[PDB]
Amino acid sequence: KRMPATRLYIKDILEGYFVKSEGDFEPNYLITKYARKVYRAKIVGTVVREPLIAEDETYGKFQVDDGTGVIWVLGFRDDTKFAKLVRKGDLVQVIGKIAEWRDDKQILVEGVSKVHPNMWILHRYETLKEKIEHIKKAKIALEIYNQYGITAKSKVIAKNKGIEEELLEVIDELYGIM
Amino acid sequence: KRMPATRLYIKDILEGYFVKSEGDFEPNYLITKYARKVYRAKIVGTVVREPLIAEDETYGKFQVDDGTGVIWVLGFRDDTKFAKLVRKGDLVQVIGKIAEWRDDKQILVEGVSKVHPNMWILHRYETLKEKIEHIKKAKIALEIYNQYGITAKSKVIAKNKGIEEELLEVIDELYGIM
Amino acid sequence: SLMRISELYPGMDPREVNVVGRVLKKYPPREYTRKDGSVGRVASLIIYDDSGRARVVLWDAKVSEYYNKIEVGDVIKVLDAQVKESLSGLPELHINFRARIILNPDDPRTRKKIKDIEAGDRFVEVRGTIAKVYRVLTYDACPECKKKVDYDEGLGVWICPEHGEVQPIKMTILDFGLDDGTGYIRVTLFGDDAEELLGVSPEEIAEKIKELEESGLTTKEAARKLAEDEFYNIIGREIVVRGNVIEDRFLGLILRASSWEDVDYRREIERIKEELEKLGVM
Amino acid sequence: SLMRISELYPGMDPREVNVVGRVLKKYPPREYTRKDGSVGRVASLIIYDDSGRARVVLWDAKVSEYYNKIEVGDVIKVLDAQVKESLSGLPELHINFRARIILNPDDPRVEMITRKKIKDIEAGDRFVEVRGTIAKVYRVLTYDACPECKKKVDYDEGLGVWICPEHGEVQPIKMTILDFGLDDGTGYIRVTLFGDDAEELLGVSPEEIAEKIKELEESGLTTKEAARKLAEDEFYNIIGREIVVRGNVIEDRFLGLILRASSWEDVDYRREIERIKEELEKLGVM
Amino acid sequence: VRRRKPAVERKISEIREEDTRVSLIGRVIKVDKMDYMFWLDDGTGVAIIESESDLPKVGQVVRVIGRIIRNEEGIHIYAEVIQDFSDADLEALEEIRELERKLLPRLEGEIVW
Amino acid sequence: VRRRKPAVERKISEIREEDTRVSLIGRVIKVDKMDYMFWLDDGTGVAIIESESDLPKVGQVVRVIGRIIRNEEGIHIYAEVIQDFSDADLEALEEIRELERKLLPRLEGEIVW
DNA sequence: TTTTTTTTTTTTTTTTTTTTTTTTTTTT
Ligand SMILES: [Zn+2]
Ligand SMILES: [Zn+2]
């Protein structure tokens, strides 16, 4: 399998809780304040500064601002090529893995490309739609968790209300983190 | 010490009373009709004739006219060089010691140099300013001399009115000459 | 009618069947055995119009009625015939009791989210982000069937297994992944569609593949390398792909994209507004 | 504002600071260490208006904000800057958080971009201007000097080089010394001119003077004797010339008051006549 | 640690005193190619945009991200980013700005752990 | 003993019959290079100056010291000294001539021994 | 309608030289 890249506001990534998987092959993920488990991030913003390419070409990075937050986007080794593509002022869409370095969340670039201003508008519309969809589902799942917890009975009730079983585990994990 | 060269009209030098000092080291001086003791003269005029250099180079002389009088300027031995510098028609400024030869006052050249026509104008302005300054001071000093003479009381009165003690001695000496 | 032979399909309403064709071939009449044990007659012809060819099958009294009246080069008009699928999958015109023939006539002649996609899905429209580039390469293809052609060193010519000696055309293959926020799917583009997305000519891609192969890489290795080194810029681009989903026995679902196009942002925003209205936002 | 750079003074109210200037020089931005140990940035420019020049010092974010936007020949307007005294005693404009700069402003100013008589002179007098006649020429000579400190250099015969006690091995320059007297009608004072000022008055090159000094020394005269002789024999023509000298008065323990002239210039006759007119008005002439 | 403050989306008429970095979207009405400044009109006001290097064209629709400069001459924007918003559906943008204004505070306030 | 009579400073229009040696200051308006004569205009008149060797240029401001020659052809000056007065402030010279005229006779008359 | 076939995943980041001031008398 290959899980989805979740379209989010940079603020939601920044305020999230990064989870480092102990296994050498397990993917790292983030749990947002609204109990959203995110493996990959899909953001749309403006490149605010001219990229930073290390002289030794070991890493390349660029900054993206979407209005709700500012995040760094990093490409290592030959992946430095991604940072060379962009320039200060470009309006871009970024997909990648969420990483945490020095307790600051960032995006490990998988892809970056220039977008039309209407794509930024489409991004804002989709981000808000998905956010409302998720919050309403998580609110019902939280009530199920507070009443029954993670039991075989609660899993059946969650499926009946259109809630994935994984959502109850995310709530429990978030409660454990907090 | 080295006393000042007084800026005067040639007429004032010519009409003065030359005083030969009896000492072999004492400087000769002149007392003008306005009781001015003059050790050195500073005049500005035109060289009216081509200089006179003695064939044996023992003396060199040149004539200067300032409008108020005509005087001879003399340089002896190697000082003949001063007369060689000038030519007929040059507008010059002369500084030197006043001398009297054959009952005619003259200037023993210490320095002679060509001047700009505006220097001749500046000379006339300074000469008149100094003359008025001196006459007014000598008029007050003459009143002091006629009332008290050369006494310790008159010297105190002279200092109070901005008159030098030497001025009263010059008046007494001039009265003795006349 | 303006109907053409190319428009015939098996099981179409015989009342709609109205085509003309010139007779290309006439086969001998034959006998056939009926379900009741009796023996009937059947005869076949091949006709064609400006669009294609069709077998015309005359049954029983229609053989006696028309067969000798028709000759090669003549034009016939066929009405009210049943359309059947031939043994090669093509439409045939069956001239039974109901059908008529006129000799030498007077005639002028769906949006689906990746999470909902299934194996074997047809005509699916998916809007998403290019997430990965697997391979970029070009192969020599037949200009008719677009299949891989083989170079024969003995004859010095290019041989297509279906069309024989052909002049090969360079066909571009682009394998990438697409993400829509609810799922991930592999995508394959071919020729003109792939060249349009890549923005590089197939002849230029062939030259770059050759340089990589000369360095000691196989065709497989060179295709993956060129995708990562030169076509990584395409990643992050939002596009709309349309195609059919085939299930690979190890690679999983692969979307064979027939076409790709730029996102119509106003159309997409309207879809989102519909979803927001369903959530009680507007 | 009508304010000019010449009107700036250290500690003036930054709210009054409003000047314009064309950029004459731009120096590279530098780092500096703060009292807290952090490192900041600072960059300096030189600007000038119709009245004078000022150093402009951009601090920290003001460097990032304006430094690359400014170029030589551009005009800037400076507002609300602190005025400090430079290391040479002159006003400098400090562009800190409070200050503002307007690049190529719309401003009307943009298109526009002590005498003492010898009789009154005392020992140790500074910045005195005296107008008088050259009356005597004491000595004319040239010596080998250091190009940096202008002090006498010594020739080392063992190493074949010229040694300055302050700067070590140096390339010597010929320095001219002119000692003369000046008379203003109220007194007499000794005057000394050096190098370029002395050469300008003498109208002879220092290399030519050195050659003449050498000829005199070869004849059996010392350096002292040769200097007095050259002044009397060749530079006697300078006597009788009216000049304006400016300098400081030092008192020699036997020679008396010596005016070390920093500069000399020709007499401005109209300026002098105006001074005399002032004196005549005081006497009741005009 | 002065982390980069995200550009706050505003209309020219709604700029606040506490705003230090803003995002404005409008049409260019005048370009001064000597002082490197341009006049941006969004429908709600006109802002004087001081640019360092990029000067737009007259009549071009642009999005500007800049730092606000408050001086005695007024409030001008020192432009950091100037983007071509010529084909941008500002009607749709205005509609999403209103949707975010209404729904974002309600979504955050729904959290009852 | 005929001692040299000092040159009496005059204007061309103020020359007296008893004057034998004068000082005039003016502008050259014409030079005759064959008869060695030139025309001097001071503002008050024009005098014909006969020169022995030095001929000035036309338009040059000069000061002439000469002996007056009175003949049937008129009054001409036999030039003894011709000086270049081109940079001379004649305004200042005129002012000092008036100061001397007023103050010199008063200064001499103040002597009451 | 096509080529050729093994999906995904972690971690790595900076102001001078050298010293004795001035003065009489001599003239074709
Ligand atoms: Zn083929
Ligand atoms: Zn030195």
PDB file of C-alpha atoms (C1' of nucleotides) in Angstrom, chain A residues 20 27-28 40 59 77 97 106, chain G residues 7-14:
ATOM      1  CA  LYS A  20       8.116   8.876  15.394  1.00  0.00           C
ATOM      2  CA  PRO A  27       6.381   5.566   8.336  1.00  0.00           C
ATOM      3  CA  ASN A  28       6.350   8.555  10.626  1.00  0.00           C
ATOM      4  CA  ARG A  40       1.870  12.870   3.926  1.00  0.00           C
ATOM      5  CA  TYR A  59      20.784  19.731   1.076  1.00  0.00           C
ATOM      6  CA  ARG A  77      21.497  14.772  -1.732  1.00  0.00           C
ATOM      7  CA  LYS A  97       6.422  13.477   4.134  1.00  0.00           C
ATOM      8  CA  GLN A 106       8.730  20.530   8.290  1.00  0.00           C
TER       9      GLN A 106
ATOM     10  C1'  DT G   7       3.810  -2.060  -4.924  1.00  0.00           C
ATOM     11  C1'  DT G   8       5.498   0.914  -0.552  1.00  0.00           C
ATOM     12  C1'  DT G   9       9.305   2.415   3.804  1.00  0.00           C
ATOM     13  C1'  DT G  10      14.131   5.809   6.964  1.00  0.00           C
ATOM     14  C1'  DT G  11      17.645   9.053   7.690  1.00  0.00           C
ATOM     15  C1'  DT G  12      20.752  12.756   6.281  1.00  0.00           C
ATOM     16  C1'  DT G  13      20.469  19.306   8.094  1.00  0.00           C
ATOM     17  C1'  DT G  14      25.567  25.530  10.922  1.00  0.00           C
TER      18       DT G  14
END
